[PDB]
């Protein structure tokens, strides 16, 4: 809808493909930028449309936010593993890698494991068991 | 780093399409959202039951003139 013409018929992007070097950085990644929306200066913008970029914007969400909550869930399930062993003061410096990998492959299916603790009420700690200040 | 290493076309440029919608919801016809005082066939443009937007034709001459600071190009 906007003035973000695709880079196929943008009259300022074809000069970036006209005089350019070759090696690996300005030939194959430049013809892959051709299906991207670009303004009046030939630079590929990132707009948010309804359906033409519905999943084109949702791949950087769903790919990142899975392995954002994969680092976070394997770090949460490791700190909870070493506190039931009653040795958490010394297991945080010397990382017990047979358990941290065991708590990593338990976090590979973390979206269907967080909601098993939300409906069971075990994700959050209740407010009368958390240290606070004089308030 | 992308402009420094030659490839200025590899910049991540997010077009601010939510505040380009605000100007297009007030009268800026430059982008082309074509809604709600950018669409003259709308309920907000005409104000169909009364048609008492006497401020509106003077306002749209101001927002769509490119010589003032009223709702600059974003």
């Amino acid at each position: 809808n906007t003035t973000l013409v695709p880079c196929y018929k943008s009259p300022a992007f074809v000069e970036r493909m006209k005089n350019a070097p070759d090696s690996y950085y300005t030939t194959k990644p430049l013809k892959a930028y051709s299906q991207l929306l670009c303004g009046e200066d030939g630079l590929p913008r990132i707009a948010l449309d309804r359906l033409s970029l519905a999943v084109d914007v949702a791949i950087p969400i769903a790919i990142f936010l899975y392995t954002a909550g994969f680092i976070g869930w394997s770090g949460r399930s490791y700190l909870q593993a070493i506190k039931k062993q009653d040795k958490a003061e010394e297991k945080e410096v010397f990382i017990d890698v047979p358990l941290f990998i065991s708590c990593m492959v338990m976090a590979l299916f973390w979206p269907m494991a967080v909601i098993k603790e939300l409906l069971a009420g075990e994700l959050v700690a209740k407010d009368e068991e958390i240290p606070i200040s004089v308030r | 780093v992308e402009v420094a290493f030659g490839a200025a076309d590899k910049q991540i440029l997010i077009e601010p399409v939510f505040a380009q919608f605000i100007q297009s919801a007030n009268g800026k016809i430059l982008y082309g959202f074509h809604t709600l005082l950018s669409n003259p066939d709308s309920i907000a443009f005409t104000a169909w039951p009364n048609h008492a937007n006497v401020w509106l034709p003077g306002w749209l001459d101001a927002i769509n003139n490119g010589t003032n600071s009223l709702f600059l190009t974003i």
Binding site: - | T35, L36, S42
Partner: peptide, 29 residues
């Protein structure tokens, strides 16, 4: 408890967010 007043003000602001997002994707006019 079932939140009855916290909801229907949060999903009332989410409703106003969805009328503005209806004009944004040019769904309604």
């Amino acid at each position: 408890p079932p939140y009855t007043f916290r909801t229907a003000w949060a999903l009332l602001l989410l409703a106003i967010n969805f009328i503005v997002a209806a004009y944004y994707f040019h769904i309604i006019e």
